[PDB]
């Protein structure tokens, strides 16, 4: 069949349209400042014609779309931004190739179309709302349709049916007309939430459409029944401008974006979440795409807005499915393991979650240890008994030995002062900061001025965090209270003071007392027992009532009403 490789060429002006003929050797590039014809020979692009020779920079040549007929290799048709439709007749003796200049539209024209077989038909859609159907031999004149929606965006002739064409409107509707009855459409339905930019028919099916819109979506519709049904739905990452079906593969598409995104994607509608391929050669937004031949599914031509034109080979794309990470892994706190992996490596579109149930000594040592209150010897014996009863023998021997060294000529004043430090560092290096911190707290002042100030802080902070993970606030606060470093000791002192006011006079209350300064009334009245509360006071933030800590607690487990009787359901249950 055909042969070629990836190649590109640089143009003179940006292009925003493209079209191919039934030779697969020629291509048309149109834009605001360019109208050329190129040749795809075997290794490069060669530029034959330049249909702007005779440069009168009229606004009749600012093309927005261009089509090439597929019956006669000589007809062409462009759509301008003035409202003019020009038909060119390449096989003409003169240098200019203009033939006709229909000027029946008032506003901008967006799309043009040709009939696949009958080589005298045109279809044009404009921004006014109407769409016209010229006849390129001046017989029977024009025939006008009205959509009554908005500016129209696209127009396409059906491949199997002979007399049917489709339209796409800016409000989000899709209609379906027959050209022998320009009086009422044969269907209408809402497709997208917003403008619909593109549509396409299936080369092989009989009722399959494909619409793309500004809401970043590509839908496929079935029209063999009486009502339109939606089968598939592809969710891209930007707005969609063009949609083309791949030849000979009835589940493939090709899309390009209208903003932000410069790539070209090929989707498979049975896997809408991940693209099957992506070409990322351009450096600006792509404007037009086209498959070369209706029977070779390996060639794609694109024209972008960086003055470039390229041909792509499907066997050279960047497949992103086989460039990803197939599994995830995490380690828990209680020793659990979470592992999810693909269903092709474990036992190609699903995964398999599984938790493996792979530190009781930590939580049992934390609660049973004694730190302050008694002198050294009994604390050491208590800790040794605990450690021995848990099964850790070396720790118990360390606790016992630490009593003989302190709690007891002679040996020199501090003969062991250089070994307790090594023991503490030995225990802290393995990750057991519990032992080091406990020993530091118990000993107190005999080992204090030996360890650097930035190491005690590290050891205390790590221990506090590990304790807070397991939700043991009593031990954490006990450590904070007896900490040897000021920075740790100042942790539960910042912003833990409450300000309370008397609700009769709305005045602040003094720091120590239960009688108001102006009202001369006691305000810490218990709402259950009707006594004076000098200690702990519970409070409800909804109705501003409360009392003793253990009175309200017992009242609220038998009723669901504020005991002061204000019609409040204090727990909202």
């Amino acid at each position: 069949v055909l042969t070629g490789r990836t190649m590109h060429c640089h143009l003179d002006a940006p292009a925003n349209a493209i079209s191919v003929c039934r030779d697969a050797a020629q291509v048309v590039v149109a834009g605001r400042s360019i109208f050329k014809i190129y040749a795809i020979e075997e290794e490069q692009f060669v530029e034959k014609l330049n249909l702007r020779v005779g440069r009168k920079p009229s606004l009749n040549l600012s093309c927005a779309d261009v089509v090439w007929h597929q019956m006669d290799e000589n007809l062409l048709a462009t759509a301008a931004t003035n409202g003019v439709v020009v038909t060119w007749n390449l096989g003409r003796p003169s240098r200019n190739k203009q033939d006709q200049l229909f000027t029946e539209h008032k506003r901008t024209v967006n799309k043009v179309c040709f009939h696949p077989t009958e080589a005298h038909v045109l279809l044009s859609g404009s921004q006014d709302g109407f769409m016209k159907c010229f006849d390129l031999r001046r017989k029977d004149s024009v025939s006008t349709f009205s959509g009554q929606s908005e500016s129209v965006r696209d127009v396409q002739f059906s491949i199997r049916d002979y007399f049917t064409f489709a339209s796409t409107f800016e409000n989000g509707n899709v209609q379906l007309w027959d050209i022998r009855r320009p009086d009422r459409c044969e269907r209408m339905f809402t497709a997208h939430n917003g403008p619909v930019f593109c549509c396409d028919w299936h080369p092989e099916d009989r009722g399959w459409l494909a619409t793309g819109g500004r809401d970043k979506m590509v839908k496929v519709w079935d029209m063999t029944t009486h009502r339109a049904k939606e089968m598939h739905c592809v969710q891209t990452i930007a707005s969609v401008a063009r949609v083309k079906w791949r030849p000979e593969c009835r589940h493939h598409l090709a899309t390009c974006s209208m903003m932000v995104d410069h790539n070209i994607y090929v989707w498979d509608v049975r896997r809408p979440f991940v693209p099957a391929a992506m070409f990322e050669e351009h450096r600006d937004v792509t404007t037009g795409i086209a498959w070369r031949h209706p029977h070779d599914p390996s060639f794609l031509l694109s024209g972008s807005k960086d003055s470039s034109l390229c041909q792509h080979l499907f066997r050279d794309a960047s497949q992103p499915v086989e460039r990803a990470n197939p599994e995830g892994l995490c380690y828990g706190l209680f020793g659990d393991l979470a592992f999810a992996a693909k269903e092709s490596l474990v036992a190609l579109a699903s995964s398999a979650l599984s938790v493996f149930e792979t530190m009781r000594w930590f939580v049992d040592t934390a609660e049973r240890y004694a730190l302050a209150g008694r002198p050294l010897a009994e604390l050491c014996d208590h800790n040794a008994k605990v450690a021995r009863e848990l099964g850790r023998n070396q720790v118990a021997q360390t606790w016992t030995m630490l009593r003989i060294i302190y709690c007891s000529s002679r040996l020199p004043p501090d003969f062991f002062g250089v070994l307790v430090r090594d023991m503490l560092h030995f225990y802290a290096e393995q990750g057991d900061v519990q032992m080091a911190v406990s020993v530091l707290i118990v000993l107190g002042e005999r080992v204090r001025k030996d360890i650097d100030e930035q190491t005690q802080e590290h050891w205390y902070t790590s221990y506090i965090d590990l304790l807070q993970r397991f939700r043991l606030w009593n031990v954490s606060n006990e450590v904070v209270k007896l900490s040897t470093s000021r920075a740790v000791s100042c942790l539960n002192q910042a912003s833990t003071t409450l300000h309370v006011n008397c609700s009769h006079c709305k005045r602040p209350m003094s720091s120590r007392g239960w009688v108001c300064d102006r009202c001369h009334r006691c305000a810490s009245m218990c709402a259950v027992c009707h006594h004076v509360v000098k200690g702990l006071f519970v409070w409800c933030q909804g109705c501003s009532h409360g009392g003793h800590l253990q009175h309200i607690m017992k009242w609220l487990e038998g009723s669901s009403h504020c005991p002061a009787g204000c019609g409040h359901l204090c727990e909202y249950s």
């Binding site: 931004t81 409202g83 506003r107 901008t108 921004q127 500004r214 707005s239 209208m258 903003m259 600006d284």
Partner: protein, 320 residues
Amino acid sequence: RGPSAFIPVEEVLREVDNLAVVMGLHPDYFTSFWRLHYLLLHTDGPLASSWRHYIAIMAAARHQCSYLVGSHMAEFLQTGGDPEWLLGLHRAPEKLRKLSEINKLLAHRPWLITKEHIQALLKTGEHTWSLAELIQALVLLTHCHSLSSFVFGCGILPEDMLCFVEDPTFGYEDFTRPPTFRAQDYTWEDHGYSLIQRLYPEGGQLLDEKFQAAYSLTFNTIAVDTSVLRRAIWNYIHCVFGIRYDDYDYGEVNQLLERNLKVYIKTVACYPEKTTRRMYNLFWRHFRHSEKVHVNLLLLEARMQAALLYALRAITRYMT
């Protein structure tokens, strides 16, 4: 004596509590405007509230609008602002004193905004901006400018500025005294909506809903149809700022617009501090009083759209 010094009090009775009553004569537009204002100034977002009110103060002081500046400084004091900041621009931090260059260009000469300004704003350093933080500020500045223009245009009564501005004598210069912006290469509906939606979604939705309320607003006493002279005024005000449409024939502008209206539009848009009562009364002598408000609303929308399109094109050129 009542709401507006130009519209008679009896007319307002028959047809910031003053602007809200003069703008209420077209109900379907007031709701959308209030929704956008509430989103832009009260709902939580990428910028702090006090910074937002300071941005509003800076933007309203370009056109020398006392009403808005007073209201916004009153609001700024009560949200937790620094009273020291109200002595001048030179007391604010070096992250708000960067928007002061884009301020002039958006207010006076939109066509000079390029990608280098965006690069200067987003360049790495010790006090930088993010994309969301800056796209909010741009919309806020445009909103305040247009509001000032409308407030001066309708002549609203109440119930310093030179310290909040750099280069006080810039002003407006005519366009023809630079390439033309073709309104088919970069359109709001196809190009700007998508970008503003990706970078700031709710604001984009609200702006698109507000743009469609100033289009479906009929004219009662025309004498072609309402859709024609509306197009004429819209295209004229866009052409003032440097945007030309390809499909529109520009001859009909004179045949559809009286020469008296053509000066009121330019005065209220380009130099809104010089509008006066005689100007208000010269044009459309024998017409209802609720149309010279519709003209102002159209003008406000057009100015907003022009400035936003220029800024968005700059950002898109930067990011490509």
